[PDB]
Amino acid sequence: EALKILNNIRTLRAQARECTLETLEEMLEKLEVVVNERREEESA
Amino acid sequence: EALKILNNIRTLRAQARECTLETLEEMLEKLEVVVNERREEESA
Amino acid sequence: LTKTDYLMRLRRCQTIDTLERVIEKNKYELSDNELAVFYSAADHRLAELTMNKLYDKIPSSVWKFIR
Amino acid sequence: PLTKTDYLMRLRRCQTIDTLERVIEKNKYELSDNELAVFYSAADHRLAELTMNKLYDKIPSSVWKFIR
């Protein structure tokens, strides 16, 4: 969806400045959980 | 800004289905790099 | 408006199903730009409703248990 | 669908960033938008391995910090 911004390092820093850190932590731990879930999914 | 939309675990999964795993790792690695830049900055 | 503010309101919500309902009603009524912050409080409440514990800040462990 | 390695093959030729900034700019308009997500990976990758004058198969987490 709007994920295309996430794999772009330049604007990612930028739009991250306008967000607080306490949310950034939330988002990251959210992201890390999501990606861990597909590791099992694909697997082998 | 529009990065803040991603802080939704259900919507994170949704938009995640259409991305492959190897990209997801990149996005995640992009992100942690970004928050680690702020963990030092803001917090420290 | 801040996330805690939404979380205060959503804190009143019980049995998840009711929350799903209020969250569902909010989706179509909210400012969109404002809606994103509500989603932050929404996840928090659902998490702290999924586990029947009230966290000020959500531990990384629980997110896996979210449906 | 097109993969990141494919975009990277072409972008490996793009030199001095100014040309890259131009090629990325040229791509963004006309790009698939959804595929662009895969292309952005190659843009950052190439930009990474260009800022540092080293050619990585996989970009180290260490490198990302130096990007402007």
User: Which residue of A16, A21, A25 is in closest CB contact with B3?
Assistant: A16
d(CA C11, CA C45): 6
> Chain D closest CA to B36's CA: distance in Å?
10
Domain count, chain C: 1
Contact B22 D4 (CB under 8 A): yes
d(CA A2, CA A13): 16
- Contact criterion met (CB below 8 Å) for D42 and B23: no
Residue type, B11: T
Q: Does C1 touch chain B (CB under 8 A)?
A: no
User: Which residue of C36, C37, C63 is in closest CB contact with B9?
Assistant: C63
3-state secondary structure of B7: coil
DSSP letters along C12-61, please?
T--TTHHHHHHHHHHHTTS-STTHHHHHHHHHHHHHHHHTT---SS--TT
In chain A, the residue whose alpha carbon lies closest to the alpha carbon of D33 is: A4
Q: What is the CATH number of the domain that holds C1?
A: 1.20.1280.40
| Residues 17 through 46 of chain C touching chain A, CB cutoff 8 Å | 40, 43
Closest CA to A6 of C46, C42, C8, D41: D41
> Chain C closest CA to B13's CA: distance in Å?
10
Contact B7 C63 (CB under 8 A): no
Q: Other CB atoms closer than 10 Å to residue C48's CB: what's the count?
A: 18
* List of residues 6+ apart from D68 with CB closer than 8 A: A10
By the 10 Å C-beta count (0-12 exposed, 13-18 middle, 19+ buried), B11 is classed as: middle
What domains are there in chain B, each with its CATH number? 1-44 (1.10.287.1050)
Backbone angles phi, psi at A35, to 5 degrees: -70, -30
Touching partners of D (3+ C-beta pairs < 8 Å): A, B
- Contact criterion met (CB below 8 Å) for D67 and A34: no
The experimental technique behind this entry is: X-ray
- Contact criterion met (CB below 8 Å) for A2 and B18: no
Tokens of A1: 């969806």
Range of the domain at D43: 1-68
> Chain C closest CA to A29's CA: distance in Å?
6
Tokens of D62: 């260490």
Touching partners of C (3+ C-beta pairs < 8 Å): A, B
d(CA A33, CA A27): 10
Q: Does C50 touch chain A (CB under 8 A)?
A: no
Q: Helix D36-51 and helix D4-11: axis angle, to 10°?
A: 50
* Cα pseudo-dihedral B13, B35, A7, C4, rounded to 10: 40
DSSP letters along D10-60, please?
HHTT--TTHHHHHHHHHHHTTS-STTHHHHHHHHHHHHHHHHTT---SS--
H, E, C per residue of A3-44: HHHCCCHHHHHHHHHCCCHHHHHHHHHHHHHHHHHHHHHHCC
In chain C, the residue whose alpha carbon lies closest to the alpha carbon of B7 is: C40
d(CA C39, CA C17): 16
Touching partners of A (3+ C-beta pairs < 8 Å): B, C, D
d(CA D54, CA B8): 37
d(CA D38, CA D15): 20
- Contact criterion met (CB below 8 Å) for C10 and C41: yes
* List of residues 6+ apart from D25 with CB closer than 8 A: none
Tokens of A17: 């400045």
